[PDB]
Amino acid sequence: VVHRRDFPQDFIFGAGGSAYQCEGAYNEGNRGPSIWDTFTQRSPAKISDGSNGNQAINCYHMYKEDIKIMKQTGLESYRFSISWSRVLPGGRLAAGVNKDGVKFYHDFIDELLANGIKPSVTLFHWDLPQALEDEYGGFLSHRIVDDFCEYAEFCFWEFGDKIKYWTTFNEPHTFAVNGYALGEFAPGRGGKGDEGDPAIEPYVVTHNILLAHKAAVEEYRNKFQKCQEGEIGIVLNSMWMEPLSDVQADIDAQKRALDFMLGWFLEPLTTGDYPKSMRELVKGRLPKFSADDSEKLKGCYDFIGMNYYTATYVTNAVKLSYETDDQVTKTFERNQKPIGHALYGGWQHVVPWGLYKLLVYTKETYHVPVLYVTESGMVEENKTKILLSEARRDAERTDYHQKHLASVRDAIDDGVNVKGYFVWSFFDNFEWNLGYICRYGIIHVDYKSFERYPKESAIWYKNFIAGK
Ligand SMILES: OC[C@@H]1[C@@H](O)[C@H](O)[C@@H](O)[C@@H]1NCc1ccc(Br)cc1
Numbered sequence: 298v299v300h301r302r303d304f305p306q307d308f309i310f311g312a313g314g315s316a317y318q319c320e321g322a323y324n325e326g327n328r329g330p331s332i333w334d335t336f337t338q339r340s341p342a343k344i345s346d347g348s349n350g351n352q353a354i355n356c357y358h359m360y361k362e363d364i365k366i367m368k369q370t371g372l373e374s375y376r377f378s379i380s381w382s383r384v385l386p387g388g389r390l391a392a393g394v395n396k397d398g399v400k401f402y403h404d405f406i407d408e409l410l411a412n413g414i415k416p417s418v419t420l421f422h423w424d425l426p427q428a429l430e431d432e433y434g435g436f437l438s439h440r441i442v443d444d445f446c447e448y449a450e451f452c453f454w455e456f457g458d459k460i461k462y463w464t465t466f467n468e469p470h471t472f473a474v475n476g477y478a479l480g481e482f483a484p485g486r487g488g489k490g491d492e493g494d495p496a497i498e499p500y501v502v503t504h505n506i507l508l509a510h511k512a513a514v515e516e517y518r519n520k521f522q523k524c525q526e527g528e529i530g531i532v533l534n535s536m537w538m539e540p541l542s543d544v545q546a547d548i549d550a551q552k553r554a555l556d557f558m559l560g561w562f563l564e565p566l567t568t569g570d571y572p573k574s575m576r577e578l579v580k581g582r583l584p585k586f587s588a589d590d591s592e593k594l595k596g597c598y599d600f601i602g603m604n605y606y607t608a609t610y611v612t613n614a615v616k617l618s619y620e621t622d623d624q625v626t627k628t629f630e631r632n633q634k635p636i637g638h639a640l641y642g643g644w645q646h647v648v649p650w651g652l653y654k655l656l657v658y659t660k661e662t663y664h665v666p667v668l669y670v671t672e673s674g675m676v677e678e679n680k681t682k683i684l685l686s687e688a689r690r691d692a693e694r695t696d697y698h699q700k701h702l703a704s705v706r707d708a709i710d711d712g713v714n715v716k717g718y719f720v721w722s723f724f725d726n727f728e729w730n731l732g733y734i735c736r737y738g739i740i741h742v743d744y745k746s747f748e749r750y751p752k753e754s755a756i757w758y759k760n761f762i763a764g765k
Contacts, residue, residue: 298703299699299702299703299706300761300764300765301761301762301763301764301765302764302765303706304705304706304709305709305716307716308715308716308717308718309373309374309415309669309716309717309718310371310372310373310374310717310718310719310758310761310762311372311373311374311375311376311415311417311717311718311719311720312367312370312372312375312376312719312720312721312722312723312739312758313375313376313377313417313671313672313719313720313721313722313723314356314375314376314377314378314722314723314724314726315377315378315419315422315467315726316377316378316379316380316383316422316424317331317333317334317350317353317378317380317422317423317424317727318350318353318354318422318722318726318727318728318729319353319354319356319377319724319726319727320350320353320355320356320357320380320383321350321351321352321353321354321355321356321357321358322352322355322357322358323349323350323351323352324351325357326357326383326395326397326398326401327383327386327395327397327398328380328382328383328386328395328398329382329383329385329386329387329388329392329395329426329427329428330382330426330427330428331380331381331382331423331424331425331426331427331483332423332424332425332427332430332435332483332484333350333423333424333482333483333729334349334350334351334427335427335430335483335484336482336483336484336485337349337350337732340485343481343485343730344730344731344732345730345731345732345734346731346732346733346734347732348727348732348733349727349732350727352747353726353727354724354725354726354727354742354744354747355747356724357401359747360401360404360405360408361408362749363723363724363749364405364408364409364412364414365412366740366749366751367409367412367414367723368412368413368414369751369759370723370739370740370751370755370758370759370762371758371759371762371763372414372723372762373414373415373762374414374415374416374417374462374717374719375409375414375415375416375417375723376417376418376419376462376464376671376719377405377416377417377418377419378418378419378420378421378422378424378467379402379418379419379420379452379456380398380424381420381421381424381425381426381448382424382425382426382427382428383395383398383401384398384399384402384448384451384452384455385398385426385448385451386398386426386428387426387428388425388426388428388429388432388444388448389428389429389444389447390447390451392428394451399455402456403455403456406456406459406460407459410459415461415462416459416460416461416462417460417461417462417464418452418456418460418462418463418464419464419465419466419467419532420445420448420449420452420463420464420465420466420513421445421465421466421467421509422467423467423468423471423472423476423482423483425483429441429444430484435484436473436501436502436505436506436509437477437498437501437502437505438505439505439508441505441509442505442508442509442512443512445509445512445513446509446512446513446516449465449512449513449516449517450516450520453516453517453520453521453525454521457521457524457525457527458524458525460525460527461525461526461527461528462527462528463517463527463528463529463530464529464530464531464532464602464671465509465510465513465514465529465530465531466506466509466510466531466532467532467604468532468533468534468604469502469503469506469507469510469531469533469562470503470533470534470535470558470559470561470562471534472502472506473499473502473503473506474499474619474620475730476502477493477495477498477499477501477502478495478498478499478618478619478620479495479620480492480493480495481730482729482730486498487499487618495616495617495618495619495620496582496616496617496618496619497582499619500579500582500583500584500619501584503561503562504584507562507565507566507594508590510531510597511590511593511594511597513529514529514597514598514599515593515597517529528599528600528667529598529599530598530599530600530601530602530667531562531566531598531601531602532601532602532603532604532671532672533559533562533563533601533602533603533604534603534604534605534606534672535555535558535559535603535604535605535655536558536605536606536607536608536609536627536651537605537607537608537609537648537651537652537654537655537658538550538551538554538555538608538609538610538611538625538627539551539608539609539610539611539636539651539654540610540611540612541610541611541612541628541631542612546612546613547611547612547613549613550611550612550613550624550625551611552574553574553623553624553625554611554623554625554627555658555662556572556573556574556575556623557572557574557575557622557623557625558623559659560572560574560575560662560663561575563601563659563662563663563665564663565586565591565594566594566595566596566597566598566601566663567595567596567663567664568595569586569590569591569592569593569594569595570586570591571583574623575622578622578623578624579622582617599667600665600666600667600668600669600716601659601663601665601667601668601669602668602669602670602671602672603655603656603659603668603669603670603671603672604671604672604673604721605651605652605655605670605672605673606645606673606674607637607644607645607646607647607648607651608636608637608646608648608650608651608654608655609627609628609629609636609646610627610628610629610630610631610636611625611626611627611628612625612626612628613625613626614626629646636648637649640675640676640677641676641677641678641735642676642735645675645676647675647697647700649700649701649703649704650704651704652670652673652701652704652705652708653704653705653707653708656668656670656705656708656713656715657708657711657712657713659713660712660713660714665714666714667714667716668713668714668715668716669715669716669717669718669719670705670715670717670718670719671717671719672719672721673698673701673718673719673720673721674694674697674698674720674721674722674737675693675694675697675698675737676735676736676737677691677693677694677735677736677737678734678735678736679725679733679734679735679736679744685741685743685750688741688752689741689750689751689752689753690752690753691752691753691754692753694739694752694753694754695753695754695757698720698754698757698758701718702718702761705718720739720758721737722737722738722739723738723739723740724738724740724742724749725737725738725740725741725742725744726738726742738752739751739752739754739755739758740752740755
């Protein structure tokens with residue numbers, strides 16, 4: 298019971314992909330390896346099916362077609378990621394600027410704009426140049442801040458006379474947690490039999506990412522914003538955290554669970570310090586900001602993008618690690634009753650109203666002037682063994698998105714300033730440590746032949762975008 302007119306004139310509708318998950322052509326056009334190439338190549342057993350982004354779904358050679366398909370759907374904007382390491386093979390400026398890479402993105406952008414579609418660029422989507430990961434530890438070093446700045450500056454200069462939407466980081470929480478606490482994503486550090494320290498590193502990384510982010514924002518504010526008239530922000534991710542009972546302890550547990558996962562970032566970006574509840578528990582294992590760093594972090598974004606997938610109940614809990622540092626046991630079940638229908642993984646639960654509360658929480662708690670839902674979507678088993686006829690009748694995914702948008706509208710109505718919804722993902726693509734065992738897209742892709750055929754949800758969204 299939700300339509301296009303139910304939303305402001307201002308609102309933007311779109312979908313996204315991200316460089317590693319879509320481009321393929323990992324070793325063409327002089328691209329330099331990312332930690333994710335390396336991860337999947339050296340540690341194939343850490344990928345559900347051994348697969349990798351070598352070809353992914355091959356956007357690098359198929360962009361002209363993909364942009365047709367975007368426009369057949371009516372996409373108002375498309376979010377994509379620049380492979381740091383395709384424009385700068387060795388990460389620093391000294392290693393050179395890859396002109397082939399630089400042409401690709403320009404070709405790609407111009408194609409988008411030639412088609413009425415608004416380009417929207419994430420600077421970092423976890424595909425860090427291996428050359429930097431190796432030289433000084435990647436985000437375990439402060440050295441990452443300036444190199445990131447120089448990358449950032451390069452991109453603004455090179456591409457920005459045509460970009461209005463810059464995002465510095467996607468899901469630093471996921472990047473830092475899965476990467477340095479669970480050892481599950483690149484570089485694979487922290488979890489049992491792995492390499493780092495799951496008690497130390499995730500804090501160091503987030504700490505440097507926020508300083509990277511800072512560096513990039515100022516670079517843009519002071520140097521490009523007035524010229525290119527765009528907006529730079531960051532994209533965070535969170536589950537909604539519901540109190541299991543309605544005793545105190547469970548309300549504190551929600552406050553802590555959100556502090557640790559969201560506040561880990563929003564707080565610095567607000568008051569210039571990590572959440573009280575993180576200082577309490579993490580103590581001297583949490584880095585301090587210098588006087589000057591705190592100050593310059595306050596309101597250091599033009600917008601907050603949010604990736605929501607699901608909600609969980611929380612409660613007080615009973616080896617040191619980020620993982621267990623918020624002191625909260627999480628569960629999908631209240632009295633064996635699941636919080637929402639359980640999708641393929643076991644993990645995504647369809648909870649439309651969690652996006653409502655999450656969006657309200659962020660406005661209310663962190664006073665964010667501008668919010669976008671940057672990533673919303675549902676998972677689907679990659680069932681080999683059924684005809685495409687059947688696979689594309691993803692009735693449920695249409696329904697998933699409606700209920701979601703309906704919760705977004707309700708957030709706008711009750712005060713919250715959301716300006717955009719971006720389906721994830723436009724295309725079925727490579728899903729990190731799960732590789733190709735599942736699908737998120739409104740556009741089916743055959744992982745072998747790369748052929749693209751629209752699902753029903755795509756045809757729904759085409760109508761929905763076109764209502765008023
Ligand atoms: O499906 C996860 C999507 C990826 O495709 C995108 O790269 C990323 O923005 C998004 N992460 C969502 C997510 C993040 C953490 C966990 Br645990 C489960 C899901």
